[PDB]
Design a protein around this ligand. Structure first.
Ligand SMILES: CCN[C@H]1C[C@H](C)S(=O)(=O)c2sc(S(N)(=O)=O)cc21
Ligand SMILES: [Zn+2]
Length: 257
């Protein structure tokens, strides 16, 4: 029932998911001048060379690319984390125009889109168990700005026409998610939540400082997707982002000066 529209969007979510008004909700604005450089923070370790993508899917809220997480193949470690987190899926949030679409903001600046690579802590055995734990997930957030094309995104773009409406999926094997990463792995980090229902407070957020650039043609393809199912009144999948939430009793730490 939940969505991004006037009658089911972020302002309505708390009714079915009261934790929407909790103490560690995401996304947040990253105030670069308030964030503290923490020299104790380790470099991120992104090990994606054995990543095995499975399928790409329109779920009525975003599109996602899913991975085989039945063993340690695509994993995130290091940074603020202890232990190993397996990549399960990635998805995006984007806007109706280039001046909005990101969930996190940087000094109130909104990017055109935001990529989330979702990982779960192997010590909990599966994703369903992990989301019930304060250190269950690590989500790697990457900003998208519009400019030059991102070659590593093109295979994704190429196939969106085949998953236009809710419930559609396609084979999406042999995709290398390394092609979506920026040069630098400098990051901000803070304790937060899923940004969609059920909004569980189970996420260590790792948001990269460096955006990737994607082309206008690439993000236009995102905006042609549909929230609706096939045969239903067409409502473009645009503006599928939750606004910044109160930081409350939290510190955002920077891995860089
Ligand atoms: C459709 C809702 N999906 C939820 C629950 C899934 C179990 S998930 O894969 O853990 C995940 S990751 C994010 S986000 N936007 O914070 O990165 C939202 C969700
Ligand atoms: Zn997300």
């Amino acid at each position: 029932h939940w969505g991004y529209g006037k009658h089911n969007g972020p302002e309505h979510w708390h009714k079915d998911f009261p934790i929407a008004k909790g103490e560690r909700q995401s996304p947040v604005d990253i105030d670069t001048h308030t964030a503290k450089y923490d020299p104790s923070l380790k470099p991120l370790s992104v090990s994606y060379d054995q990543a095995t993508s499975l399928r790409i899917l329109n779920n009525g809220h975003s599109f996602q690319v899913t991975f085989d997480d039945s063993q340690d193949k695509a994993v995130l470690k290091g940074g603020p984390l202890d232990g190993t987190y397996r990549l399960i899926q990635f998805h995006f949030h984007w806007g109706s125009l280039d001046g909005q679409g990101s969930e996190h903001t940087v000094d109130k600046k909104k990017y055109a889109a935001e990529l989330h690579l979702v990982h779960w802590n192997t010590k909990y055995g599966d994703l369903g168990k992990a989301v019930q734990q304060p250190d269950g997930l690590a989500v790697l957030g990457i900003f998208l700005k519009v400019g030059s094309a991102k070659p590593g995104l093109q295979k994704v773009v190429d196939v969106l026409d085949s998953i236009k409406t809710e419930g559609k999926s396609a084979d999406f094997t042999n995709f290398d998610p390394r092609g979506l990463l920026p040069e630098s792995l400098d990051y901000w980090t803070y304790p937060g939540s899923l940004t969609t229902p059920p909004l569980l407070e189970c996420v260590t957020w790792i948001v990269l400082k460096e955006p990737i650039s994607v082309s206008s043609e690439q993000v236009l393809k995102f905006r042609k997707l549909n929230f609706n199912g096939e045969g239903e009144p067409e409502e473009l999948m645009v503006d599928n982002w939750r606004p910044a939430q109160p930081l409350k009793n939290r510190q955002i730490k920077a891995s860089f000066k």
